[PDB]
Design a protein around this motif. Structure first.
Motif, PDB file in Angstrom:
ATOM      1  N   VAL A   1       1.118  -1.463  -0.294  1.00  0.00           N
ATOM      2  CA  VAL A   1      -0.127  -0.378  -0.342  1.00  0.00           C
ATOM      3  C   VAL A   1       1.128   1.865   0.454  1.00  0.00           C
ATOM      4  N   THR A   2       1.724   1.267   0.142  1.00  0.00           N
ATOM      5  CA  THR A   2       2.886   2.084   0.289  1.00  0.00           C
ATOM      6  C   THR A   2       3.752   2.758  -0.854  1.00  0.00           C
ATOM      7  N   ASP A   3       3.947   1.459  -1.376  1.00  0.00           N
ATOM      8  CA  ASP A   3       4.222   1.661  -2.912  1.00  0.00           C
ATOM      9  C   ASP A   3       3.075   2.274  -3.971  1.00  0.00           C
ATOM     10  N   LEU A   4       1.995   1.398  -3.273  1.00  0.00           N
ATOM     11  CA  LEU A   4       0.785   1.642  -4.257  1.00  0.00           C
ATOM     12  C   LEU A   4       0.551   3.211  -4.287  1.00  0.00           C
ATOM     13  N   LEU A   5       0.334   4.573  -2.741  1.00  0.00           N
ATOM     14  CA  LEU A   5       0.196   4.795  -2.919  1.00  0.00           C
ATOM     15  C   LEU A   5       1.056   6.458  -3.256  1.00  0.00           C
ATOM     16  N   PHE A   6       2.424   6.160  -3.067  1.00  0.00           N
ATOM     17  CA  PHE A   6       3.904   6.803  -3.115  1.00  0.00           C
ATOM     18  C   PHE A   6       4.184   6.578  -4.934  1.00  0.00           C
ATOM     19  N   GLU A   7       4.532   5.935  -5.280  1.00  0.00           N
ATOM     20  CA  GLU A   7       5.101   6.208  -6.204  1.00  0.00           C
ATOM     21  C   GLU A   7       3.764   5.844  -7.238  1.00  0.00           C
ATOM     22  N   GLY A   8       2.051   5.101  -6.960  1.00  0.00           N
ATOM     23  CA  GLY A   8       1.288   4.685  -7.538  1.00  0.00           C
ATOM     24  C   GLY A   8       1.715   3.741  -8.585  1.00  0.00           C
ATOM     25  N   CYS A   9       2.195   2.623  -8.096  1.00  0.00           N
ATOM     26  CA  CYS A   9       2.450   1.520  -9.189  1.00  0.00           C
ATOM     27  C   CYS A   9       2.941   0.565  -8.196  1.00  0.00           C
ATOM     28  N   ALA A  10       2.252  -0.630  -7.872  1.00  0.00           N
ATOM     29  CA  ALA A  10       2.483  -2.321  -7.154  1.00  0.00           C
ATOM     30  C   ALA A  10       3.589  -3.297  -7.797  1.00  0.00           C
ATOM     31  N   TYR A  11       3.616  -4.072  -7.778  1.00  0.00           N
ATOM     32  CA  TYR A  11       4.799  -5.127  -8.157  1.00  0.00           C
ATOM     33  C   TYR A  11       5.299  -6.088  -7.244  1.00  0.00           C
ATOM     34  N   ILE A  12       3.738  -7.142  -7.498  1.00  0.00           N
ATOM     35  CA  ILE A  12       4.571  -8.806  -6.226  1.00  0.00           C
ATOM     36  C   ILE A  12       5.303  -9.792  -7.580  1.00  0.00           C
ATOM     37  N   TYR A  13       6.265 -10.252  -7.045  1.00  0.00           N
ATOM     38  CA  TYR A  13       6.497 -11.144  -8.138  1.00  0.00           C
ATOM     39  C   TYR A  13       6.114 -12.440  -6.959  1.00  0.00           C
TER      40      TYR A  13
END
Lengths: 368, 92
Positions: A93-105
């Motif tokens: 959720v931090t990545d999704l909010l701050f950067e605007g994207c999220a990735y999961i291997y």
């Protein structure tokens, strides 16, 4: 496939970041209170939604054939052998909010968060996405990443692939407010406060003049001394003066309030949650905050997971202690539905988190 | 495992502190009223939540095989032979 793809590919062949100013953003979050509080409220609130795993669609997908009990254990209990569920969710959720994207291997039986600041997305000429590039140093195959992105409208192009940072729109205001606050302080240290001015055309012995100033200063103040009348002789004149610039004209109060509202609005948290109000205010505002802000985010995430795994996946709030409904209303709801033969008893036990009871009648409708 | 790990490792190979100004923070807490009150309200309120121990998942872990009654006694009653539960919680 899509004949236009070869052309769309050339409109944005590789993703680009949108969180410019990363350093000053990390300073702001580390130093400015209202940003820290509102961000922590959003992260800490979103992290505690449970996920329910539903039925399975028949369509084929990447993450084929995973048994439901495993997927449930990974989502709800343990993402991987080394990291908890809560830390994993908060990172995502931090990545999704701050950067605007999220990735999961994904690795057969493991999900790993992958830092959004180092990933890059490369467009395919025929399909959607060709490969993901990490730090220009390793390429992940498309069927090995789960990808989430916020909305994106960039340089006048509606943007596939890329994601707009939410927090990036707030920094402009945090600067201006800080400036005002510093000015509000420093005007006091640059200040100048005179009590009296006395004047002559004669020339006076400097050492005695200084002594006389210290005598007047200590004598006249009511805290230090008693005397209050002053008699001037030999022609010393008292010069009337006025405060040529006053603290009264620094009525900042509404402007800074505006900036606070802007910050508070960018996350989308009602002011009643920053204040606390009356009951009629407070209880509906929690539902406003949860349903409007958080649930669309989790719907973005769950729709990406249902695309990847192919199971129906959706978030359950009913673990959340903040939302959990009033003990009175729920009882009259459930009782009335049960007695009128719409809902079986064990369904009510389930909704009250109780284990079903095996007495057959508890799974029967009662007509009257 | 995670091929990127060797790279992530180099982005932050060792933790670093974030509570700069430790002295002035301890002065403030020791001297400024509204900080002292609000911090004491939070600490003293959080320390008095009980913990319930539920069912056991079958997955293996570090602290293997501990009987539930022991874990309950440690969390709710006595963390160690020398320190109470309340002091332990407030410290944490």
């Amino acid at each position: 496939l899509n004949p236009g793809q070869r052309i769309i590919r050339d409109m944005e062949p590789v993703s680009h970041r949108t969180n410019r100013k990363p350093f000053t953003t990390g300073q702001a979050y580390s130093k400015i209170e209202i940003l820290n509080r509102t961000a922590n409220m959003v992260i800490d609130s979103a992290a505690e939604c449970s996920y329910t795993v539903g039925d399975k669609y028949n369509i084929v997908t990447y993450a084929n054939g995973v048994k439901t009990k495993t997927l449930d254990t990974l989502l709800n209990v343990r993402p991987n052998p080394f990291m908890d569920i809560s830390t994993f969710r908060r990172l995502v959720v931090t990545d999704l909010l701050f950067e605007g994207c999220a990735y999961i291997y994904w690795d057969g039986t493991s999900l790993y968060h992958v830092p959004a600041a180092l990933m890059q997305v490369e467009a395919d000429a025929n399909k959607f996405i060709k490969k993901f590039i990490f730090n220009n140093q390793i390429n992940y195959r498309v069927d090995e990443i789960i990808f989430i992105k916020d909305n994106s409208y960039v340089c006048g192009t509606n943007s596939q692939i890329s994601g707009q940072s939410r927090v990036a729109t707030v920094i402009d205001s945090l600067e201006k407010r800080s400036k005002m606050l510093n000015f509000k302080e420093k005007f006091l240290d640059n200040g100048t406060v005179i009590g009296l001015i006395l004047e002559t055309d004669e020339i006076l012995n400097k050492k005695l003049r200084e002594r006389k100033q210290e005598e007047l200063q200590l004598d006249y103040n009511p805290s230090t001394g008693q005397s209050s009348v002053l008699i001037l002789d030999g022609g010393m004149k008292a010069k009337p003066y006025s405060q040529i610039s006053s603290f009264k004209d620094l009525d900042f109060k509404e402007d800074i309030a505006g900036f606070n509202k802007s910050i508070c609005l960018a996350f989308g948290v009602p002011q009643v949650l920053i204040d606390g109000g009356n009951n009629a205010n407070i209880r509906p505002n929690i539902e406003l905050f949860y349903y409007m802000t958080i649930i669309p985010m989790l719907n973005k995430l769950t729709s990406s997971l249902t695309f990847f795994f192919g199971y129906k996946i959706t978030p359950n709030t009913k673990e959340v202690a903040a939302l959990t409904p009033d003990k009175e209303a729920e009882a009259k709801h459930l009782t009335s539905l049960v007695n009128n033969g719409i809902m079986t008893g064990n369904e009510a036990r389930l909704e009250l988190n109780l284990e079903p009871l095996d007495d057959e009648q508890m799974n029967r409708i009662r007509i009257p």
